[PDB]
Amino acid sequence: GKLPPGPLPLPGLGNLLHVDFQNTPYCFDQLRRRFGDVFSLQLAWTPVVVLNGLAAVREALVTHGEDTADRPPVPITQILGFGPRSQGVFLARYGPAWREQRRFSVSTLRNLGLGKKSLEQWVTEEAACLCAAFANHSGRPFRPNGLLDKAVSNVIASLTCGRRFEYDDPRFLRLLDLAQEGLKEESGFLREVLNAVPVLLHIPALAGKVLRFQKAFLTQLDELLTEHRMTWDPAQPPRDLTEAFLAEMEKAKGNPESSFNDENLRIVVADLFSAGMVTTSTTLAWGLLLMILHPDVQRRVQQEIDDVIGQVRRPEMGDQAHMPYTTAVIHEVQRFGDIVPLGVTHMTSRDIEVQGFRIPKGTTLITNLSSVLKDEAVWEKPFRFHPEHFLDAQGHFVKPEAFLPFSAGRRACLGEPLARMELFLFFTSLLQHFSFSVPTGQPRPSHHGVFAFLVSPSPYELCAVPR
Numbered sequence: 001g002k003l004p005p006g007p008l009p010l011p012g013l014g015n016l017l018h019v020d021f022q023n024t025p026y027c028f029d030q031l032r033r034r035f036g037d038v039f040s041l042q043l044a045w046t047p048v049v050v051l052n053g054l055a056a057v058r059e060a061l062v063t064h065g066e067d068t069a070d071r072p073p074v075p076i077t078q079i080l081g082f083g084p085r086s087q088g089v090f091l092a093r094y095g096p097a098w099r100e101q102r103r104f105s106v107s108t109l110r111n112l113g114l115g116k117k118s119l120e121q122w123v124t125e126e127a128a129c130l131c132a133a134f135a136n137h138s139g140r141p142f143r144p145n146g147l148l149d150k151a152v153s154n155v156i157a158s159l160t161c162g163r164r165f166e167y168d169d170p171r172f173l174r175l176l177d178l179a180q181e182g183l184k185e186e187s188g189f190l191r192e193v194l195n196a197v198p199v200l201l202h203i204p205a206l207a208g209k210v211l212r213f214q215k216a217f218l219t220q221l222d223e224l225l226t227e228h229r230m231t232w233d234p235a236q237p238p239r240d241l242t243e244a245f246l247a248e249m250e251k252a253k254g255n256p257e258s259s260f261n262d263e264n265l266r267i268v269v270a271d272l273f274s275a276g277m278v279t280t281s282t283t284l285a286w287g288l289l290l291m292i293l294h295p296d297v298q299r300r301v302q303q304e305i306d307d308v309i310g311q312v313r314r315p316e317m318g319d320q321a322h323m324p325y326t327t328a329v330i331h332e333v334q335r336f337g338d339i340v341p342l343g344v345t346h347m348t349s350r351d352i353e354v355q356g357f358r359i360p361k362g363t364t365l366i367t368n369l370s371s372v373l374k375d376e377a378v379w380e381k382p383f384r385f386h387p388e389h390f391l392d393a394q395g396h397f398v399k400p401e402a403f404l405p406f407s408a409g410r411r412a413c414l415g416e417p418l419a420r421m422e423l424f425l426f427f428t429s430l431l432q433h434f435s436f437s438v439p440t441g442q443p444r445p446s447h448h449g450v451f452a453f454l455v456s457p458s459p460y461e462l463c464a465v466p467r
């Protein structure tokens, strides 16, 4: 069939000069408006197809799910112990190694707490610590990002590592620091080159600085894993994912095919931990920013929290069903924050058809989630913070199909169930006991965030006064 349209490619650079990597989301909007919902790009040697809108993304990830569940190979990951039976989950290639960790991560989380009141109470406990930390700032203006990252990170640590860390633990802080730095490494020109030419890694000079943060991250994590291997009580049912993983490694000794091995234990755990320390807290960072930028909405939320929960009892997942306005606000924060605009790259394993065009095997697929979350054809005021995007005239919460912050298909975020719970409990817990606002004498903060693979709100301070 006919391949997707797109800007005319240069001789060797291809379309590298037709894409503004400073604000790619905007550049792609222009391309979408110019060539359509499914267009092509030749980034150097990598053929790319961008998917815009719910339909294009869905036909690829759901309808053609089997053929689009693979990731682009990333040979550089070798530096972290990645191998055929050791791929973690996020960067894992479509196959048994992924499926085994995928199924394991999903079911273990569910067994450990997800969907039960135990996790809720654990989270609201961590929430209480978060509140107390906010209170230490008295009326003084501060940046909530660090405390949000620490509190959220403790929830995933509890699940994976069976413990939390004090907001000032050196190892905890270093772990969080390295995790955020390495999120800068995933976006480097050098990595692209070494990735195309695997052999170039034999030069210690290069290999030695390519993924230094991810390596530091894993190294720092090994120390924690080693202590855990020591405290673990195999005579009791696993308390966390690391123990569950460990018990599987026992059962799997002698099985060359099992992905439950030492190399993969640090990758899987680092996979879940890192993912959990940089997603939800960012959304929460957007949440608090939007709440000081729209005090009215913040009050409506507090009002609902008062009417349904009060200012005593700790929030509970059972409350959400009776808090449609707060649920709408949270969903809008996710929609507007648009924290993962271009999603995570996919790769076709077979030739497929999308919106009439043909997408050859091996094509790097880009799911433009931002275009689904800001689709002017679907949302009323896509470029505005508008809780009514998830509310009907009656005040009922409705979730449109264009709400794909987590993508779709067999590869969709496995942390969604955890994210849903964290956002509700942490958000209501914060607004239930605090009142946020822009610090007098300071300019209204921008609702425009700084572009990256993971989009954070622009730096800002706020005042948190008790209630």
Ligand code: HEM
Residues within 6 Å of the ligand: 089, 090, 091, 102, 156, 271, 272, 273, 275, 276, 279, 280, 283, 339, 340, 343, 344, 345, 346, 367, 405, 406, 407, 408, 410, 411, 412, 413, 414, 415, 416, 418, 419
């Ligand atoms: C509000 C927060 C979050 C957002 C917006 C988000 C978004 C995403 C997106 C866009 C993907 C890619 C889906 C695809 O490949 O098409 C994904 C993947 C993934 N996320 Fe998240 N995520 C969030 C939270 C977390 C959390 C809390 C965890 C849990 C540890 C997590 C774990 C993962 C994992 C393991 C994958 C890879 C799944 C696979 O390839 O099979 N994420 N997420």
Ligand SMILES: CC1(C)SCCN(S(=O)(=O)c2ccc(Oc3ccncc3)cc2)[C@H]1C(=O)NO
Residues within 6 Å of the ligand: 080, 088, 090, 091, 179, 182, 183, 186, 214, 217, 267, 268, 269, 270, 271, 272, 274, 275, 278, 279, 340, 413, 454
């Ligand atoms: C275990 C690894 C160190 S292996 C090498 C790469 N990373 S990473 O720290 O660079 C990273 C962190 C967050 C991220 O963003 C996410 C995740 C989930 N949902 C939405 C966004 C992407 C990549 C770790 C990894 O695979 N995590 O999943």
Ligand SMILES: [Zn+2]
Residues within 6 Å of the ligand: 161, 162, 228, 232, 239, 240, 242, 243
């Ligand atoms: Zn444990």
Ligand SMILES: [Zn+2]
Residues within 6 Å of the ligand: 392, 394, 395, 396
């Ligand atoms: Zn209704």
